[PDB]
């Protein structure tokens, strides 16, 4: 598990060293804000119907009666250019807010915790996450258990042993094809079906798909070896 | 020998799950996967 | 999950069939572009929203030919190969309730001129440079992704989200679910025929409800209504004079020389361009409401469909067992199953 | 004793009540006492 984590962090360094487009979400924010400031500068070139775009070339040429007609065109178009910019920036600030409130929620739930929410911290079962800073952003390294090498087993919902139906406490019943085991429902580690692995409920008629097996009792040979202790003390006491 | 092709996009690899009323698949081993997520 | 992608040619909306107007609109510069960038940003995001919600599996799972799910009858929510699109019975109900406008799928004069020129708002829109673009994923591709999510759910439980799809018998999956809500797995198996009959009866009420009440998809039809009302308001605004001698750009040029016409035409450019900035602002604001809804739908796909949720009332009222996604026009419908 | 766990004496819990907790090991050894005692009874006879 340590060698897999160390190897998986190695692929983060190699990926970030190798592919150019990895931070596309953050560079696209810097690109949008720079494109908006550049569009707002280029809009100073627009005439809006005035004799020039340049505010001083009007005042170089026209008196206070004619200039006010040209200057009010430039005020009208420039002021419309700022209202367009500030509206688009107020709308973009809500996209960044929504992303920052998600990043604060992933900081709380993936970094400060462990999350039972499916696919909230990458594909797999969440173990933990490590935050990393980036320009105008955060990067989470989400660590996940992913189940890898599955085998097919025959399975049953319950076991019949004593006219009684047995169910796993924690786990599932599986058969290798000849024997029956309990195992945990996330990793194949088979165990003998005991009275400690299982609980009883009801007779064997009500469960659809139930099968016959023998449930070991951990107390039974612990008293049967106490019967062979009892019976040998009786055998020896026949002799005097 | 390059050209621009146009095609109907594939949604993913097609896969029948090996379902039966009495069969289960259980993982005998696991991969620990570390994955980057980037947020503005 | 999405809304109609629109591309508006502001050069044709404002200066419809005039070079004289077009040469005046260049004095406003980037205004014609910045609107195309804004609407392209919205349109590109509709494909993103649809992929964030539906493309949550990279394998297209399919259902076995034998349907022994322990008595649970999914035949109303699984595909129907008899149809020209592989949608389920409940999805074909959902597609009948919402009446789309201009899905982008080709126009060819015989469907707009003559008879179909007169009783048509979509024609009046398209003739003024307003165009509706097709989504990247067709209603067949959304139904294949939805079929993969649903076939993964019934055959494989949560495990197809966290790794490879591991098969599990359906009543064995439902036992794990019952344990997830703190009800012991023997309560399922001792009641399995009742629980199956209750699920089959509860899915029967989904078909009956969607067949009976008109207003069920009100959230999705109200998105189609808002976008159509906006495209119609944007067309009606070509009728406004803004103080010019006429609303019609050609009736000015039919009557006035280049000195007098520029005074009238700049009024129409000023009001028309203000009409597009109002539309594109309102569409940028609506696209954020749809984004917020698509990010919720992607979160319910991940947490309700690909999992089982301990979050209270996140997947209907009750203790969550599982959910089945169903496609709808510009949306997703979840059938949340709950122990009450 | 399989359905329950013990903690502390009966003075500290507000609202606690009296009942009898069955021990699944007790009759499994009491039937082993009647096995023991009948082996003793039979061995009185020789
Ligand atoms: C299914 O799993 C079973 C449990 O692991 C397995 O049975 C086990 O098989 C080994 C031999 O391969 C037995 O080992 C004993 O074999 C002989 C018995 O006389 C001795 O000489 C050895 O020293 C050793 O004690 C296990 O005892 C046996 N377990 C049980 C409970 O019978 C099955 O073979 C597996 N079946 C398949 C199809 O894989
Ligand atoms: C799961 O539910 C399905 C829908 O409730 C059900 O399918 C339905 O089955 C009945 C009986 O086979 C069909 O009844 C019709 O059968 C033919 C149709 O040509 C006619 O001769 C009959 O008079 C009658 O109209 C339903 O039409 C059919 N419904 C659908 C939508 O397919 C399944 O049988 C259920 N699954 C199980 C395992 O019971
Ligand atoms: C838990 O609630 C179940 C219903 O949600 C219930 O199942 C219902 O049982 C009644 C009888 O108690 C059935 O009533 C019908 O029974 C026969 C026909 O099958 C007729 O003689 C009756 O007049 C009546 O039509 C219900 O049909 C049945 N419903 C379902 C969905 O199975 C369980 O019995 C309840 N369990 C407990 C322990 O209370
Ligand atoms: C499982 O399916 C087989 C048919 O493939 C059937 O004969 C058998 O009775 C089924 N068992 C259960 C418990 O449903
Ligand atoms: C049997 O009992 C005698 C006492 O009478 C004791 O010395 C001896 O060790 C015992 N042997 C066994 C096998 O119990
Ligand atoms: C419960 O309330 C009753 C009065 O209704 C009171 O007499 C009794 O002592 C209370 N018991 C506990 C354990 O609080
Ligand atoms: C008592 O012991 C004798 C051996 O001396 C045996 O034959 C008989 O079956 C025993 N009876 C009982 C009730 O244990």
Numbering used by the authors:
A (entry chain A): 923 to 1162
B (entry chain A): 689 to 728
C (entry chain B): 729 to 1068
D (entry chain B): 1117 to 1162
Q: What did the article's authors report about this structure?
A:
Although the viral evolution is slowed by the RNA proofreading capability of its replication machinery, a variant with a single-residue substitution (D614G) in its spike (S) protein rapidly became the dominant strain throughout the world. The S protein is produced as a single-chain precursor and is subsequently processed by a furin-like protease into the receptor-binding fragment S1 and the fusion fragment S2 (7). After engagement of the receptor-binding domain (RBD) in S1 with the viral receptor angiotensin-converting enzyme 2 (ACE2) on the host cell surface, followed by a second proteolytic cleavage within S2 (S2 site), the S protein undergoes large conformational changes, which result in the dissociation of S1 and the irreversible refolding of S2 into a postfusion structure. We determined the cryoelectron microscopy (cryo-EM) structures of the full-length G614 S trimer using RELION.
The overall structure of the G614 S protein in the closed, three RBDdown prefusion conformation is very similar to that of our published D614 S trimer. In the three RBDdown structure, the four domains in each S1, including NTD, RBD, CTD1, and CTD2, wrap around the three-fold axis of the trimer, protecting the prefusion S2. The furin cleavage site is disordered, which makes it uncertain whether this structure represents the uncleaved or cleaved trimer, although the preparation contains primarily the cleaved forms. The D614G substitution eliminates a salt bridge between D614 in CTD2 of one subunit and K854 in the FPPR of the adjacent subunit, but the FPPR in the three RBDdown conformation of the G614 trimer remains structured. To examine the structural changes resulting from the D614G substitution, we superposed the structures of the G614 trimer onto the D614 trimer in the closed conformation, aligning them by the invariant S2. A shift by a clockwise, outward rotation of all three S1 subunits, relative to the D614 structure, is evident even for the G614 trimer in the closed conformation. Thus, the D614G substitution has led to a slightly more open conformation than that of the D614 trimer, even when all three RBDs are down. The closed D614 trimer thus has three ordered FPPRs and three disordered 630 loops, whereas the closed G614 trimer has three structured 630 loops along with three ordered FPPRs. In the G614 trimer, one side of the 630 loop packs along a long hydrophobic surface, largely solvent-exposed in the D614 trimer, formed by residues on the upward-facing surface of the CTD2 along with Pro295 from the NTD. An ordered 630 loop that stabilizes the CTD2 by closing off an exposed, hydrophobic surface may retard S1 shedding, thereby enhancing the stability of a cleaved S trimer.
